[PDB]
Write a protein that binds this ligand. Structure first.
Ligand SMILES: CC(C)Cn1c(=O)n(C)c(=O)c2nc[nH]c21
Ligand SMILES: CC(C)Cn1c(=O)n(C)c(=O)c2nc[nH]c21
Ligand SMILES: [Mg+2]
Ligand SMILES: [Mg+2]
Ligand SMILES: [Zn+2]
Ligand SMILES: [Zn+2]
Lengths: 335, 335
């Protein structure tokens, strides 16, 4: 086990935000932080450390300050230098989930322990992502794809993310569940795992269907399964929240996603496997049309459905994705 | 990636066996090597390097000498200091499989590539075993157990071993599949994974059932699935081969298995969960009783069945397990 050094912790703690940022606000722009600090990775770690510690949740559940920081840094160490699925993506999902829980009032549907676990889970949900999706592993006969097929689980990356999450938390120095009872620890692990596994987009249609059925049948807060579905739906929302952010911020995320997809396509061309147009740098896809498509077919539809049927406090997400769609449409009609 | 140093390789190559051992013989006794050499772990690594390199298979498939040695050492690094599931167990399974393939003539049912992959697989089949079985993870609500429940695969340990095998092989310096074509590499990985997953004893009955059907319908060497089942059955045989070795050697293995089981039992008592008789140190069970039970209802029938139905050249395994049962019975009747 490679321990986190005092220098590494000090590099994050020394970051001075000068009270010029509201990490609890939906308007927070992580790209601004990345551009204004010479050490963007330390600054990013600082954003989540500040946000999580200041929430009072870690302290409430017996997690020490240093343990929380070590956890954040151990997670960071496991994210690669890819265009999109890097440390910044999970910092963003974590911060975004905080806004859904507290600014969006989703915390009213969960216990405090579940809110804590959901925020922690955001940081481990994409561990060791290599910039290629599950399909790539299966199409290229990659070892990880072969193992997933033989073991009987199509969630290639998600099970991998869970395994690494368990590895990180097995270290006493980074165990953010260190203050929980044995019963709560087992409960927390299952919730964390359920949430990470729920991010597999191959389960999207079914996930949305189940959420809708829960909402229409009547949410019962005393039902652990109902609350679990809420947790899974929230992390899914954060995972596809890029299109619900202020236009300019949404575009920056889109350019990152695009470059990552193109790099996967470059690898697929080399391996002689099928390359979907959206992953092909040579088919000059239009950014605007692609964003309108993701909004209409996936993300916009998802937010309109979950906000309209249960997460009423997250209306701003819908108003913004609708506004962004109109802006992209305007761009299309202009070219 | 932690590279293997020249000094580490030198420590293995400096081991002088002289001509005191025949690593290709069913009579080879690994305990003799362990007891006599001051650096038993280096000597054990030397046994496998000598056996595998001198087989001609690594060279035939483009595996370089240093690559093979690095692979052996990378595997060794991942075995823990537990009583039974340590590096010596996999060295034993590897050596035993060689005897089944060449002394037992099982190589006649496989391609040379499959023989090579089978031998390599023996070294990675128990990577990072912690001295407790799959049941332990489930009974104690361990994170790995929870992930298994959520993922759908009950072979907790075996999937883990495969994951680490993939990790080791991802290193160009230890990639023993480095000389294979892309097609053969994918084939090799699937075979290795199938074989490791086949070692989960929870699937024993089904594994034997399918093997029997293979014999019932007729083995066809040109059928890739038939040869795959042969590979899986052979590694299973090697895995439970302790009872087929010369009595004194078999007895020493039994002592190691027993102590590991007792330690799992001690841990279960500390966690407040059920402890089965076989794992209870406090009952002071007779070594002979446990071996007779294992022979009578598991290993005994298994060898009699696979040898009688297809592996006819491995008759000595059946003859020895029968003579061993008789000796255990005499130890009991004498006490
Ligand atoms: C990255 C991917 C899993 C989800 N995702 C995304 O976040 N944005 C912004 C997209 O435009 C997009 N298009 C497909 N998938 C997408
Ligand atoms: C390690 C275990 C799963 C297999 N195994 C074994 O190899 N020996 C020698 C035993 O006596 C035994 N008893 C139960 N399982 C056993
Ligand atoms: Mg993901
Ligand atoms: Mg095993
Ligand atoms: Zn994600
Ligand atoms: Zn084994």
């Amino acid at each position: 086990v490679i321990a986190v050094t005092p220098e590494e912790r000090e590099a994050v703690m020394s970051i001075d935000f000068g009270g010029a940022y509201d990490f609890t606000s939906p308007g927070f722009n992580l790209f601004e932080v990345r551009e204004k600090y010479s050490e963007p990775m330390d600054a990013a770690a600082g954003v989540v450390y500040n946000l999580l510690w200041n929430s009072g949740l870690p302290e409430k559940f017996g997690c020490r300050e240093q343990t929380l920081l070590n956890f954040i840094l151990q997670c960071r160490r496991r994210y690669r230098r890819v265009p999109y699925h890097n440390f910044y993506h999970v910092v963003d999902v974590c911060q975004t989930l905080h806004t859904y829980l507290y600014t969006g009032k989703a915390s009213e549907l969960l216990t405090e322990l579940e809110c804590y676990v959901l925020l922690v889970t955001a940081l481990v949900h994409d561990l060791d992502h290599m910039g290629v999706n599950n399909s790539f592993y299966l199409k290229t006969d990659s070892p990880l794809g072969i193992l997933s097929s033989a073991s009987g689980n199509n969630s290639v990356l998600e099970v991998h993310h869970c395994s690494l999450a368990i590895e990180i938390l097995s270290d006493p120095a980074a165990d953010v569940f260190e203050g929980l009872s044995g019963q709560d620890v087992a409960y927390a692990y299952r919730a964390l795992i359920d949430c990470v596994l729920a991010t597999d987009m191959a389960k999207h249609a079914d996930a949305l269907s189940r959420f809708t059925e829960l909402a229409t049948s009547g949410f019962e807060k005393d039902n652990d399964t109902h609350r679990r579905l809420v947790m899974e739906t929230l992390i899914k929302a954060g995972d596809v929240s890029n299109v619900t952010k202020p236009f300019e911020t949404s575009r920056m995320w889109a350019m990152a996603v695009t470059e990552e997809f193109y790099r996967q396509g470059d690898m697929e061309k080399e391996k002689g496997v099928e390359v979907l147009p959206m992953f092909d740098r040579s088919k000059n896809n239009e950014l605007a049309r692609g964003q309108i498509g993701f909004i209409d077919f996936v993300a916009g539809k998802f937010f309109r459905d979950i906000v309209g049927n249960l997460f009423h406090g997250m209306q701003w997400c819908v108003d913004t994705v609708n506004s962004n769609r109109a802006k992209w449409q305007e761009i299309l009609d202009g070219r």
